[PDB]
Design a binder for these strands. Structure first.
Lengths: 123, 51, 50, 106, 50, 167, 23, 196
RNA sequence: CUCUAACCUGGGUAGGUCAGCAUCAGUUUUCGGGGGCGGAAAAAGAAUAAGGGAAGGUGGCUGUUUAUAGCCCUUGUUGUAAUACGUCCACUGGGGACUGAGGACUGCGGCUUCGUGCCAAGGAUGCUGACAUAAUGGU
RNA sequence: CUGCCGAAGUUUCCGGAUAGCAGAAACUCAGAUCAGUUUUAUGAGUAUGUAAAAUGAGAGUUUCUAGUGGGCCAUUUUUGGUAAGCAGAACUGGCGAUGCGGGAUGAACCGAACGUGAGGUUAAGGUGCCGGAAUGUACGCUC
RNA sequence: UUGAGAAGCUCAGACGAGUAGGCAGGCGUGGAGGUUUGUGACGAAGCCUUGGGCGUGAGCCUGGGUCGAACAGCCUCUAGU
RNA sequence: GGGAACUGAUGAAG
């Protein structure tokens, strides 16, 4: 099944572009005076359950394999029977040596490691 | 069961599934010929063309 | 059994009539428009929505 | 240059719109010589384009192109309603298109 | 089902045939003829819920 | 368009009245559902037989027997004004009784701005003699030596190359 | 139970000829 | 049926508010319109009809620094250029880019004397107006409000006609030679059966 | 002996994206084609026999009655008429547009060809073509 | 942060009540138990109320518990009224809680009540340009 | 036919504004017990980013730069959240 | 007989 997104532009809290105190993460407005709350046309949209994505092609990367944080060499082993539905995303704090051994074994399991190239310059 | 709503007017297979009469209809039967007679009474034509 | 059969069918949810309605809709049918009885002309209305 | 031009000259007219709401996913196209919504049934389905000329050159040339087709007639004056793979930019109102004669059925 | 359908389909004609016949008599005679009235009606809404 | 309908009807017979009388009307109606609605309108104001009492027996169309022959129609109109008082007699020259009353409505819609229900047509008679036509302009399109140039000539595709002839 | 509406019938005009009125 | 890169619309005999609407759409269509003999346009209504409709427009100026008020232009060209200025969204970026495709001039300058002059059959006076009506001529009107260049253009246009007339007889004498040479080619008369 | 397996020797064979085109299914829109059935068993009209009438009076002589033009009205007849209008076909040719959800078989059906199988029948498959110093996709 | 249900804004007595509207459980009945409804019948001086037909729809009981007795208008009677408005009583709705197409922008006007999208079709209103759509067809008007 | 986290799986319909209010599921922050044969000087936390990814959203995961000693996921408890 | 930015002085630039 080809992956699809009902929306691609994230939601952006109202007037979080003008003021630097107001952050961009979404916060539903609380006043009935609001133009946005009454949903006047022309104002920005809102997070609703309508924009929920397909319950089967959810959590999937655009390739089709879902992600999976592998933080050591025995976390990629579980992905042995799931190499065509999961991509072994290595965690960020893993050292640049313990990383180069996950790659050499995930490659045997045919698992896509998404960022195997970090800290690893090849010769 | 019934994943698509097929249309028995525009599909010629589901129509036969629902209606086991489509193998004999003859929608246009020639019930008349050249010899059709006029049936227009005089007193009706008088009250027709009155005024 | 017409009562026991009219309760079987759902209300017939139709579309808007291809070709539109008449000009101004909500006056009685006998002065143009379309409301109230249409007699045989409800036939030529369903040959638009359907 | 009269031994060429296997298309029909056209002009992109406007987006689909109401008075206040415009619908840039479907365009309005005015074909030359098409002056009736019954004479527009000949250009239904043809593959139209929009050829222009960018400054920076890629792949040995400069001309780029946006393809698309024609879906509906539109009104009583022989315009049509097209649909492009990329929606046409709004700064191309009153430009010129090409209505290529294929897929030809005549 | 077809045995019921053959009965119904010929009957729709056999009642449409007679109102062809029963008006061809009176109009050629000078008699008048009210018809078998509508007993079914079909109601289609025109205004929303507002 | 218009279509002239012959309508007859009566009331429900009772034991007191075993045979109701039959009343014929020659009126005009774009379809038949407005004929059998206008029919109960005229008959209620004149014979006082309400819609909750009477019934309808026969509707037929009257096609014009001679649509290819030119004619002149004298038209008797009872017009319901803003004071509700107008009897009107007007002449129209055309081929068909269907076509006359359309023109009758149109002129009556211009000079006197009459609506549908503001008009109750009274009688339509094909007037025939030349000495009874009481209008000057209708009379002049009926002399054997008539003639005129074409009026309202105008003989898409904008940007004409040369000047129109307009002759 | 409701009183049913009216089916069809002839109505002869030998003793009752339809007269023509005017509005 | 014209998508010329440039069209020249000779304006004698046209109406103002109907040509200014035909032109206003072709400007937004992408063409490049030149309207020559703008001085001999027509307007429905008699001579004083638009005259007080424009003498009223002269009474309308700002009441702050009256050199910042409305600029009531008097030329016959700018009378019609005003007419194609409210017909376009001239407050957007597509209006003020359309207006520079229109060149409205009076008389006929020599850069457009030697070119084709199409007319609009949907805005003409002899068609759209009832015979025996009241009509006023703009260039004859705007002279009475301040356009002081009437006697020069009427003199100038008279010289162009007789020169163009001299051009025409040489052109008329040209095809009379080919009128003979067309039938003199014998192939025309036995192979006219392809319609031609 | 069996098995897997390095090398040499040979034959056939994507997923990724984007373009087509075909037979389909769903929704839909726009052109038609054919024939039934209805009304005054449409009215006309045409052709052809009667009679009547006249004119906005033709030839003839302002006045008259088809003559050196014709017109209207009534009936007969060609008629056992056409068309139009209103419908109906489980009648038929095309043209465009968007969609392809679901995932062995279960079922309703139709053709068969008497074993079956096939099928437009409980949601799309097939035949090709461009591409990785890349076509699309983003920010 | 998201989702689901969602009012009253008037009483009735005495700020406290009861009822109502919205709710939670328990427990009733698949029936004629109902119904901002229409018929027929009885009466009553076209209207009035009463009972058993049509039409739809599953109804009912209490227990324990929040919010709410503001108003702005539009509807028709209406008596007191007059230079001229108007003043007041009652009914019905909207809005209060409601975004959207028109009405050039406007809450009281016309349509329409909303998840995210694609494709079609319409309402209101429109088709000369701004502005998407006939400088269409028809007939009469007007200087 | 394996789709038994029966707190799962699966089939079909209708529905979707929402004020006071009522109900439910989740996101994140500091500490506590248990757990990950947990991550870390081959660079933990933080910080910046015209990089990529997920979720309707609160949020989370990650590439590059900076930097220099600690830190996180899961199930519960707790609040100066 | 009645009603109730404005003007100076420089200035770049197709």
């Amino acid at each position: 099944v080809n992956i699809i997104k009902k929306r691609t532009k994230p939601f952006k809290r109202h007037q979080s572009d003008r003021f630097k105190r107001v952050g961009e993460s979404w916060r539903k407005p609380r006043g009935i005076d609001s133009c946005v709350r009454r949903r006047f046309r022309g104002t920005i949209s809102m997070p609703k359950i309508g924009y929920g994505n397909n319950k089967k092609t959810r959590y999937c990367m655009p390739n089709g394999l879902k992600a999976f944080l592998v933080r050591n060499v025995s976390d990629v082993e579980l992905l042995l029977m799931h190499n065509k539905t999961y991509a072994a995303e290595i965690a960020g704090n893993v050292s640049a040596r313990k990383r180069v051994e996950i790659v050499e074994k995930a490659r045997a399991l045919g698992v896509k490691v998404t960022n195997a190239g970090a800290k690893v310059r090849s010769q | 069961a019934h994943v698509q709503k097929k249309n028995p007017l525009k599909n010629k297979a589901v129509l036969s599934r629902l209606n086991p009469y489509a193998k004999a209809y003859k929608a246009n039967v020639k019930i008349n010929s050249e010899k059709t007679p006029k049936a227009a009474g005089e007193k009706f034509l008088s009250v027709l063309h009155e005024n | 059994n017409f009562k026991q059969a009219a309760n079987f069918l759902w209300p017939f949810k139709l579309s808007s009539p291809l070709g539109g309605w008449r000009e101004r809709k909500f006056k009685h049918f006998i002065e143009g428009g379309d409301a109230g009885k249409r007699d045989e002309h409800i036939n030529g209305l369903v040959q638009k929505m359907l | 240059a009269q031994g060429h031009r296997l298309y029909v000259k056209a002009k992109h007219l406007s987006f689909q719109r109401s008075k206040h709401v415009i619908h840039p996913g479907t365009s309005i196209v005015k074909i030359e010589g098409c002056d009736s919504k019954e004479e527009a049934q000949f250009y239904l389905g043809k593959r139209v384009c929009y050829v222009y000329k960018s400054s920076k050159a890629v792949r040995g040339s400069k001309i780029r192109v946006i393809w698309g087709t024609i879906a509906r007639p539109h009104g009583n004056s022989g315009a049509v309603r097209a649909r492009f793979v990329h929606n046409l930019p709004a700064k191309t109102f009153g430009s010129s298109l090409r209505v290529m004669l294929y897929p030809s059925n005549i | 089902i077809a045995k019921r359908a053959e009965a119904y389909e010929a009957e729709y004609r056999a009642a449409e045939r007679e109102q062809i016949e029963l008006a061809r008599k009176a109009r050629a005679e000078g008699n008048y003829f009210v018809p078998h009235e509508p007993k079914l009606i079909f109601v289609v809404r025109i205004r929303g819920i507002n | 368009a218009l279509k002239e309908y012959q309508v007859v009807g009566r009331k429900v017979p009772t034991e007191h009245e075993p045979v109701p009388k039959l009343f014929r009307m020659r009126l005009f109606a774009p379809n038949e559902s407005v004929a059998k609605s206008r029919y109960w309108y005229f008959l209620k104001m004149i014979n006082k037989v309400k819609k909750a009492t009477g019934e309808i027996v026969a509707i037929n169309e009257i096609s014009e027997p001679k649509p290819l022959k030119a004619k002149v129609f004298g038209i008797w109109i009872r017009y319901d004004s803003r004071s509700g008082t107008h009897n009107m007699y007007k002449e129209f020259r055309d081929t068909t009784r269907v076509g006359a009353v359309e023109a009758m409505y149109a002129d009556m819609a211009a000079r006197h701005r009459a609506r549908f229900r503001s008009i109750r047509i009274l009688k339509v008679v094909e007037v025939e003699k030349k000495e009874d036509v009481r209008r000057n302009y209708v009379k002049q399109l009926l002399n054997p030596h008539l003639k005129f140039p074409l009026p309202h000539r105008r003989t898409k595709k904008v940007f004409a190359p040369h000047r129109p002839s307009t002759f | 139970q409701p009183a049913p509406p009216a089916k069809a019938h002839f109505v002869s005009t030998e003793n009752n000829e339809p007269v023509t009125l005017h509005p | 049926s014209e998508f010329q890169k440039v069209v020249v619309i000779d304006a004698k005999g046209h109406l103002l508010g109907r040509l200014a609407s035909v032109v206003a759409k072709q400007l937004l269509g992408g063409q490049k319109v030149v309207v020559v003999r703008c001085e001999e346009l027509n307007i429905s209504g008699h001579f004083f009809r638009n005259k007080l409709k424009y003498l009223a427009y002269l009474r309308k100026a700002c009441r702050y620094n009256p050199s910042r008020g409305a600029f009531h232009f008097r030329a016959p060209s700018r009378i019609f250029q005003k007419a194609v200025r409210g017909m376009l969204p001239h407050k957007t970026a597509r209006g003020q880019a359309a207006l520079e495709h229109l060149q409205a001039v009076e008389g006929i300058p020599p850069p457009f004397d030697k070119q084709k002059r199409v007319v609009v059959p949907a805005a003409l006076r002899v068609l759209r107006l009832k015979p025996g009506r009241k009509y006023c001529t703009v260039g004859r009107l705007s002279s009475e409000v301040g356009w002081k260049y009437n006697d020069i253009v009427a003199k100038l246009e008279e010289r162009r006609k007789v020169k163009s007339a001299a051009f025409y007889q040489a052109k008329l004498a040209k095809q009379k030679k080919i009128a003979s040479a067309k039938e003199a080619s014998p192939v025309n008369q036995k192979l006219s059966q392809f319609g031609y």
